[PDB]
Nucleic acid binder design. Sequence first.
RNA 1: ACUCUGGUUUCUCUUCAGAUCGCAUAAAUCUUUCGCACUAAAGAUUUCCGUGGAGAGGAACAACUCUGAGUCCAAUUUUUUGAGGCCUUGCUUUGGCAAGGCUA
Lengths: 73, 48, 177, 81, 84, 306, 74
Amino acid sequence: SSKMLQHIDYRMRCILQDGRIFIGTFKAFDKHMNLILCDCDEFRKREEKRVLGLVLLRGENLVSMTVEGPPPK
Amino acid sequence: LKHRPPKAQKKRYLFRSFKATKFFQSTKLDWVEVGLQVCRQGYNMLNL
Amino acid sequence: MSEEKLQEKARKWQQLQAKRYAEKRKFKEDMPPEHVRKIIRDHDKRVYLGALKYMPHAVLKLLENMPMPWEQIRDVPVLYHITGAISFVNEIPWVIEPVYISQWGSMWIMMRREKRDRRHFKRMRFPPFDDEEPPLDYADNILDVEPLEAIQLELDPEEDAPVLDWFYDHQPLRDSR
Amino acid sequence: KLVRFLMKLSHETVTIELKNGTQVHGTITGVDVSMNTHLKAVKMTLKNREPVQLETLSIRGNNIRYFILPDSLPLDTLLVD
Amino acid sequence: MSIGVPIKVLHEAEGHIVTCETNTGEVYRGKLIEAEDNMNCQMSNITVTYRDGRVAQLEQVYIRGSKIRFLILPDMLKNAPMLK
Amino acid sequence: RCSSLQPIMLLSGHEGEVYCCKFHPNGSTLASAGFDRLILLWNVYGDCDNYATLKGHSGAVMELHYNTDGSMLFSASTDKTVAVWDSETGERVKRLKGHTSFVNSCYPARRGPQLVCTGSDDGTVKLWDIRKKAAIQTFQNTYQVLAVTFNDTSDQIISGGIDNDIKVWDLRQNKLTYTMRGHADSVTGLSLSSEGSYLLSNAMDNTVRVWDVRPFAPKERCVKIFQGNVHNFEKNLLRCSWSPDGSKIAAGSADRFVYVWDTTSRRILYKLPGHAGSINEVAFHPDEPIIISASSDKRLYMGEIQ
Amino acid sequence: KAHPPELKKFMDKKLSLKLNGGRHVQGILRGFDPFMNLVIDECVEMATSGQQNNIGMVVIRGNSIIMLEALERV
RNA sequence: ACUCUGGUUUCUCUUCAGAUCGCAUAAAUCUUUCGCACUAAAGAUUUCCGUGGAGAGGAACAACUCUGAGUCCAAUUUUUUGAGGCCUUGCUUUGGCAAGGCUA
């Protein structure tokens, strides 16, 4: 399923089912679309950025992933 | 005990260099034929 | 341009790059046994004398390539001098070490059985030829003679089966890849 | 299986309405067997928000309400096995 | 071919302090004791932030993994061998 | 001076002729290859050492080329093949083996997907996506092609050969679209600008042309004709290059003189001595006004033009 | 391939279940399936009205179970 | 499950090799030690017998086994739904958002 192996270590934006945003470094995924994102900052609306860390997002609550930035050095 | 490891050469071979000359030719002989040949040739060298 | 002056123009260029960037403009034969038999039978000294320096190499290469007692005849590649000054047994006596130890263990078996059998063993007289007796021409009395069986140990076909087809050869499986 | 009809649909500019009302208009690039839809040249209007231009999107396949295909699509040669 | 990388990171998070959010907005921070292939997390010494902002102390918790929205794992597991 | 390196400093170490010399587009390293079957990677500045060597050609290297990424080096060789190398640690990542004769040319697709349009002595102009390991499209010219190149769009191939005409092939139409006629002998070297509108042409009529490869057609594309050049009995593949500002052209000549013209003035700006044989390829540094020149004298001449 | 949820730590323990619609329940665990449906002895219902409702042996579908808290020390 | 490398044998050259380069073992010379040196030890050098690796060149027949690469799932736990509808405030970017209460 190389369509998201194309996206590993890219800084991705994950819009969730409640409407919360997970901007994190896309580290890993599986068949259930559970994501491992590192250094993940949550963006919610009133704007504020909430640093979390290593988020294991369960696939049930993931709607849409999209790239924010290139992979870091 | 007195074994020192073998020393770094450049891999020259005596008989390949003999075969590269016009003075040596290659054949296949019986061992007892070249036995008699080496005995006769050493006899001729010592008599020379 | 034209057509024939674009086909001849290609023929002159194909025959230009085909030879300019040709892969050759990138940036022996043995002898019959008789030829050396006649040479040492019929026999610029410098040639003979620069040959004759390497006589202990001939002795060492001869004695190291001795036929093992399970071989009647061992044909060896020989590098000889064209003046017949020196004959070099060119090969190195390469033996597969388990085959060589097994062959000599069979030699141990058969030689012990034969010293048990031959009660009054007649050793060779030494030296086998006397002093003022010329060494034998190989062609005249050894060449066509058939050697008496060698000492290969009898191998039964049932238990020695993966070995007996090649156990007593010279270099046993040398042609088998 | 009808999802196999969608993975034959590579390089089509389709809109997708999701379960959150978000309409995503873009050229589809890849489909999984679970309809995991990977899109490019994305114009995504999350509903009750102004639309945002984004270069790449990847919708999870569960969260798709429906697709919207254009007028010029030959499905009679696409839904065959 | 069978088990995915994020469940390996979840198994790597056992013994550590993870903070799991569930479907009902309740945030559970504490020592993840055990986790399975499904994300059923037996955790312990749990600080709980409910949706209102109240914090309770629940010393032994077993969350059904279906209801887990996400878990925030320690960043130590950014160097875990299955994330390479 | 107007650079960072020394003056006229020489590059020795090529064991035979040098048929092609190219600058790395970042401008700190350098690639030169030829009759040695052996590409040499130099440093442009510093003491100009030879830091890496590329072996893996069974014949002479006709055309070196760099993509604008600069990491992978494309190399059309004489034997039958075009090799794709990397530039940092220097191992051949790919062979491209579809031509049946001597491959005279290659060219990188730099904007879109990594396509290598190649031309060879059989007449086939073959395009090469590196992930396919096969020939995508073979444009069958009836005679030999000595220089091929993409446009800026990488959607047409511009093959110059011995058919006295420069022939452009469309990648979607899969036909010859128009024939740039006006040369009287074999066209040996084609090079295209960084801005991609104009294309240089060298041929054994001892003249250099500038054409404008662009969709806007002026119906006679031979805008500028340059003299001074000569092609001799050696009949090499006399290459070409453009300046990165597009102001100067350089065509390799057979009379040992590094030729550099002005595009606008149409006069020889630089006629540089020092080489002893026919000058195959002369190249331009991307950032600074530096010129390397490759010739049959087994040597390269770096040099500050301005 | 449905492995059972790892709950012999919680057998015969006083746990407070949270159920789906903001609901709550208390009781002794008596077993499970791979689907985490729980059987409960001494079930007290404990609604949000505030008065505590004993039942006894009940069965709870595992779909509706949000969390277990072992009120007793395991 | 489709396509492109690489082969193997033999002959020779060049260079590196303190690695049991040798699962074997010689000889010479020098120095030292004691005897009083084949019957004796040490250290070092050298030469021989004759290796491994890499590189290169020839010529013999094999060419896609191998080493790689390019190329069947709607019933709890994830991807075939508890989803959708009502009320108050803070601001309305008058579209509506955020929180809570709901109703299904």
